[PDB]
Design an enzyme around this catalytic site. Structure first.
Site, PDB file in Angstrom:
ATOM      1  N   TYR A 138       8.033   2.504   0.747  1.00 44.26           N
ATOM      2  CA  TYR A 138       9.190   1.653   0.526  1.00 44.26           C
ATOM      3  C   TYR A 138       8.967   0.703  -0.648  1.00 44.26           C
ATOM      4  O   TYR A 138       7.841   0.473  -1.098  1.00 44.26           O
ATOM      5  CB  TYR A 138       9.504   0.848   1.788  1.00 44.26           C
ATOM      6  CG  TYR A 138       8.775  -0.475   1.866  1.00 44.26           C
ATOM      7  CD1 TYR A 138       9.416  -1.668   1.550  1.00 44.26           C
ATOM      8  CD2 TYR A 138       7.437  -0.530   2.236  1.00 44.26           C
ATOM      9  CE1 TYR A 138       8.749  -2.875   1.614  1.00 44.26           C
ATOM     10  CE2 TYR A 138       6.763  -1.734   2.301  1.00 44.26           C
ATOM     11  CZ  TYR A 138       7.423  -2.902   1.989  1.00 44.26           C
ATOM     12  OH  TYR A 138       6.756  -4.102   2.052  1.00 44.26           O
ATOM     13  N   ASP A 177       8.582  -6.907  -3.131  1.00 44.98           N
ATOM     14  CA  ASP A 177       7.498  -6.030  -2.716  1.00 44.98           C
ATOM     15  C   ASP A 177       7.775  -4.616  -3.203  1.00 44.98           C
ATOM     16  O   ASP A 177       8.930  -4.211  -3.354  1.00 44.98           O
ATOM     17  CB  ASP A 177       7.317  -6.039  -1.193  1.00 44.98           C
ATOM     18  CG  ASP A 177       5.951  -5.540  -0.765  1.00 44.98           C
ATOM     19  OD1 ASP A 177       5.093  -5.331  -1.648  1.00 44.98           O
ATOM     20  OD2 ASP A 177       5.734  -5.360   0.451  1.00 44.98           O
TER      21      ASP A 177
END
Lengths: 111, 862, 107
Positions: free
Chosen positions: C26, C37
């Site tokens: 992800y 992130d």
């Protein structure tokens, strides 16, 4: 009116000065500068001939300056400029003559 | 609040040679069908996925730039309001993805057919997929300009741009009535794929600098038609002469009189004598004679009765027996050879031919639309028809002149100069340096040394900080325009010298110093150092130049004068990296108003006990500088509180002493818009940005005496033009609900929703007008219930302290049309290396490229 | 009330069982904001187990009904993902989380 610019010989000399680089090494340039300052320091042709081989350390290494490599590369690797080993009799008189004529031109620039 | 950085990949956009645009009349068919097919796709790599959107574009100021874009990363297709794209999942119109509900929600899989339907007449744009109609339609978008089938492929993807040709077939059936990019589209140049606004095109020797290309502008496909018994007799004689001339040429070619119409026998029945001349034939002959006479007299100079002596001169030539037709006529013309003159006659011939073709298109394209090849005036068709019309008109004017006559005929620049310079760290204070420049064509070129602090939007030469030398006619440019030497030739190189010992500049062209009028080594009169020197290059529109700064011995070409013969050194002898260069960007961006400006002056004028301090504008009453209107806004942004009953707040409704109906609401979810100030200067007042409100809502106030102003928010990004910018919208998105009923609409993406300024006044403006646009209404405390001002919801700290405070950070920023930018030193290494084969101009890129940059929180810029 | 936008290409008919270990690929994406992130940036897939908590409950329930190789946009509601407190210095309080999970485990 008449001045230095009206004279033709000085203009022709200034035009032909940036021509003879085929036998003008940076070491040859240093020798020419030394000959010019010797001529300025009360010397004649006899002293130049006597001291034509006195200086030997003027041929410095090509790595001594960040731009000296370019001059050596252009003086060596060109078909129109090939000078590997030549006698001192022909690579000194021309240099000292160039030094003398440029010194004379500089002296006559501001009479 | 603070500055953050992230990696990103460059975006590229290719453009074909097909030109599609709309005008006020006969411009094009308006129905074009195109397909794009993808062979190979690359999954998620490096940081993000492979960005690739397809759609249409526009030429009205739209110009993507790699590296620096709008918002985050490069300005891809659909990021701005000037282009439209689709990645196959969500519509991209204004840097906002639009969710859709369509069957087959899939990404661009390999071996897929992607097409889009574009209607020029009906304002509707609909996309398509392999096996489903793509939901989503356009409505009331921009029409002026030129539409291009643009793609937004990124690094590391292969796409095939298959319109038509040897292997240009469409897998899916085209809708009827849509042109599949055929029927003589641009019959002057080959179809090639080129990037938009190239400035670093590669070359066999080095990179080539390309200026702004000159396009066909817009709304130019429509034509431009224009509006004595002796004169009638002369016209009749000329008509008979040209009639017998074309009759004799047609007879010599092998065409004679037929019975009725012998098309297969190559016989032309119009070759008849004037005695038995048909009545319709005489009718259109006299009609065309009168039309030619009217066009000839339309000029300000008449034919004039000079001598009228050669009108009675009659001559004849050879009449072979095979030239006689069945009518019995003897078409023997006269011979003349003493009518040669200046090519102004040829220019008149070309102008008359152009006018005739324009009126023919006016009376021809207006009907049929069946077998006419669509049709354009004498600027884009083949040269055969132009040559035929030219020879017809030149022989006509020769026949007219042979009868004793003597006739003689009587906005935003955009494509401007592009200043090229190096970084401000590569200054020169002492020492001789060598500079080179290679030219291809002759145009608006300026090469020479200049000060490091070069002022943008300043012509090279009309300043004290430029010492370039103009490439048009061989004249210098330094605080004026004086002749210097010989003009340029096609090709060759340009030499530029510099000296710091005695401040002399030497210019050379080809192994020779450029001689001046005086006749010596003319310099710029001992330029004082000041800060230093820097090589600056210029480039005009439609010009190609090659800047050879010099990194190796093989790079230099001539080096005849100094450079190496004297104590000169090349500028990049020992720079292991390519020298970074700063180009001049044409994107109109923003900058704070400089102080001590002689034209404009803004002072923080304090208020009173009841009026909070405001900001005023000071201008000279005399029109010393009146170029155009001013573009002004605030400093910071004003976000919209998302979600918390009411997802969207701040109902847009201006109110100037009454209740107006702007009808411009629901701009989106967040929409970080600014507060623009659009006005001009008439009475040395312009506008006065004042904040004064003491009730449960917030509004801004502007006071003016006698001028025109527009208090409409300019949005997050502003890209205006000129002419006041009145009623210039971009698009309206019509969301599809998969039916024919309609549940919701998307009336947003309004960069400048400004109406006319005469809504409030009726005849004149005698008193002051105080526009109070109420756009700030979050909440009001019921403890005091007033009786919240601005700078409360706009800041991040004074949220719960409503007070009319003017922080020392809100400064108006005037719109600089030009801004300095740096282009990257490493572009795409492929850049369509195959250059388009016969399989459908396949383009692919292999080498990736990554670049990391800032992102200012206030201004959506990278 | 979580919306999932599955992308059909990517095949895969192996639902994740309970108790085994699977990897994810992800990249983080804050609502109306920036990227915080990215597992691709570290060049290392994230390994986690199913059924032993140790992750966001909202993220787990959003990733439960997913197949192999099928990415989607799992929008996590803030009231159960990070609460009213939030991560002190990375994730602002009461903000939704958007991720595009990609599966590449060979099992």
């Amino acid at each position: 009116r008449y001045s230095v610019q009206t004279s033709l010989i000085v203009a022709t000399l200034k035009k032909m000065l940036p021509i003879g680089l085929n036998m003008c090494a940076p070491t040859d340039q240093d020798l020419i500068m030394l000959a010019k300052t010797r001529y300025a320091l009360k010397d004649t042709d006899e002293e130049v001939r006597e001291f034509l081989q006195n200086n030997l350390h003027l041929q410095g290494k090509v790595e001594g300056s960040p731009s000296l490599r370019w001059q050596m590369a252009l003086y060596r690797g060109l078909p129109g400029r090939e000078e590997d080993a030549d006698d001192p009799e022909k690579i000194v008189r021309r240099v000292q003559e160039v030094s003398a004529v440029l010194y004379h031109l500089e002296q006559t620039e501001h009479p | 609040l603070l500055l953050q950085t992230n990696l990103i990949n460059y975006v590229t956009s290719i453009r074909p040679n097909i030109f599609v645009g709309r005008a006020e009349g006969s411009t094009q068919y308006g129905k074009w069908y195109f397909e794009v097919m993808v062979d190979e796709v690359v999954p998620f790599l490096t940081a993000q996925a492979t960005h690739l959107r397809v759609g249409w574009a526009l030429t009205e100021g739209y110009s993507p730039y790699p590296g620096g874009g709008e918002g985050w990363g490069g300005n891809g297709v659909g990021d701005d309001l000037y282009s439209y794209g689709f990645d196959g999942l969500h519509l991209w119109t204004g840097h906002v993805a639009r969710p859709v509900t369509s069957p087959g929600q899939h990404l661009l899989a390999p071996e897929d057919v992607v097409s889009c339907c574009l209607d020029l007449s009906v304002p509707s744009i609909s996309f398509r997929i392999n096996g489903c109609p793509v939901q989503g339609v356009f409505e009331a978008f921009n029409l002026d300009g030129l539409f291009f089938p643009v793609v937004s492929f990124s690094a590391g993807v292969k796409v095939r741009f298959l319109l038509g040709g040897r292997h240009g077939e469409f897998k899916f059936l085209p809708p009827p009535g849509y042109a599949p990019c055929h029927e003589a589209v641009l019959p002057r140049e080959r179809l090639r794929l080129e990037p938009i606004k190239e400035y670093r095109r590669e070359g066999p020797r080095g990179p080539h600098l390309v200026g702004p290309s000159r396009c066909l502008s817009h709304t130019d496909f429509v034509p431009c038609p224009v509006d004595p018994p002796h004169l009638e007799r002369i016209r009749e004689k000329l008509a008979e002469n040209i009639h017998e001339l074309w009759a004799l040429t047609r007879i010599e070619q092998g065409w004679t009189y037929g019975p009725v119409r012998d098309d297969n026998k190559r016989l032309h029945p119009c070759l008849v004598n004037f005695h038995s001349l048909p009545e319709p034939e005489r009718n259109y002959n006299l009609q065309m004679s009168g039309e030619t006479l009217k066009t000839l007299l339309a000029l300000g100079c008449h034919v004039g009765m000079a001598d009228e002596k050669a009108e009675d001169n009659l001559k004849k030539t050879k009449l072979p027996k095979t030239y006689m037709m069945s009518n019995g006529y003897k078409p023997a013309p006269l011979d003349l050879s003493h009518v040669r003159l200046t090519p102004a006659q040829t220019t008149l011939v070309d102008r008359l031919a152009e006018n005739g073709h324009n009126v023919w298109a006016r009376d021809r394209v207006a009907q049929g639309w069946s077998y006419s090849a669509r049709l354009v005036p004498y600027r884009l068709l083949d040269e055969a028809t132009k040559r035929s019309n030219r020879d017809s008109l030149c022989q006509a004017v020769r026949t007219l002149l042979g009868y004793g006559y003597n006739i003689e005929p009587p906005q935003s620049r955009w494509d401007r100069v592009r200043i090229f310079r190096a970084e401000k760290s590569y200054t020169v204070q002492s020492g001789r340096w060598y500079f080179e420049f290679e030219a291809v064509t002759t145009g608006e070129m300026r090469v020479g040394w200049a000060r490091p602090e070069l002022r943008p939007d300043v012509e090279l030469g009309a300043d004290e900080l430029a010492y370039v030398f103009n490439g048009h006619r061989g004249q210098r440019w330094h605080l004026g325009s004086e002749p210097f030497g010989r003009p340029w030739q096609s090709g060759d190189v340009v030499g530029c010298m510099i000296d710091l010992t005695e401040n002399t500049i030497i210019f050379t062209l080809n192994g020779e110093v450029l001689m001046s009028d005086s006749g010596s080594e003319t310099a710029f009169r001992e330029i004082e150092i000041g800060d230093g020197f820097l090589p600056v290059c210029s480039l005009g529109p439609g010009q190609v130049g090659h800047l050879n700064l010099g990194q190796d011995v093989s790079s230099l070409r001539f080096f005849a004068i100094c450079g190496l013969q004297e104590g000169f050194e090349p500028f990049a002898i020992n720079m292991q990296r390519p020298v970074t260069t700063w180009f001049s960007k044409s994107l109109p961006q923003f900058e704070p108003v400089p102080p001590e400006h002689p034209h404009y002056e803004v002072a923080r004028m304090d208020g009173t006990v009841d009026t909070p301090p405001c900001l005023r504008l000071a201008h000279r009453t005399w029109g010393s500088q009146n170029s155009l209107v001013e573009m002004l806004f605030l400093r910071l942004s004003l976000p919209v509180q998302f979600h918390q009953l009411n997802t969207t707040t701040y109902y847009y409704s201006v109110r100037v002493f009454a209740g107006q109906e702007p009808s411009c609401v629901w701009v989106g979810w967040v929409t970080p818009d600014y507060h623009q100030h659009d006005m001009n200067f008439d009475l040395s007042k312009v506008r006065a940005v004042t904040v004064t409100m003491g009730d449960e809502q917030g509004n801004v106030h502007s006071s003016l005496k006698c001028s025109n102003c527009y208090m409409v928010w300019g949005g997050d990004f502003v890209s205006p033009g000129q002419q006041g910018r009145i009623s210039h919208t971009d698009l309206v998105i019509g969301c599809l609900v998969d039916l024919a009923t309609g549940l919701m609409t998307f009336t947003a993406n309004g960069k400048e929703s400004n109406t006319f300024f005469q809504v409030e006044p009726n005849t004149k403006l005698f008193p002051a007008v105080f526009v109070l646009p109420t756009h700030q209404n979050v909440i009001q405390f019921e403890l005091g219930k007033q009786k919240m001002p601005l700078s409360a919801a706009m800041f991040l700290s004074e949220r719960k302290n409503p007070a009319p405070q003017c922080p020392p950070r809100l400064e108006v920023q005037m719109l600089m049309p030009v801004s300095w930018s740096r282009m990257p030193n490493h572009f795409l290494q492929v850049e369509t290396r195959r250059a388009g084969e016969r399989l459908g101009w396949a383009v692919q890129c292999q080498d990736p490229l990554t670049m990391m940059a800032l992102h200012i929180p206030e201004e959506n810029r990278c | 009330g979580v919306e999932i936008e599955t992308i059909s290409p990517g095949d895969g008919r192996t639902f994740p069982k309970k108790g085994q270990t699977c990897v994810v690929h992800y990249t983080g994406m804050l609502q109306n904001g920036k990227k915080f992130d990215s597992s691709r940036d570290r060049n290392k897939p994230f390994k986690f187990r199913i059924g032993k908590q140790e992750v966001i409950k909202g993220f787990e329930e959003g990733a439960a009904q997913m197949s192999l190789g099928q990415r989607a946009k799992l929008t996590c509601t803030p009231d159960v993902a990070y609460g009213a407190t939030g991560h002190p210095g990375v994730i602002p309080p009461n903000a939704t989380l958007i991720f595009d999970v990609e599966l590449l485990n060979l099992e």
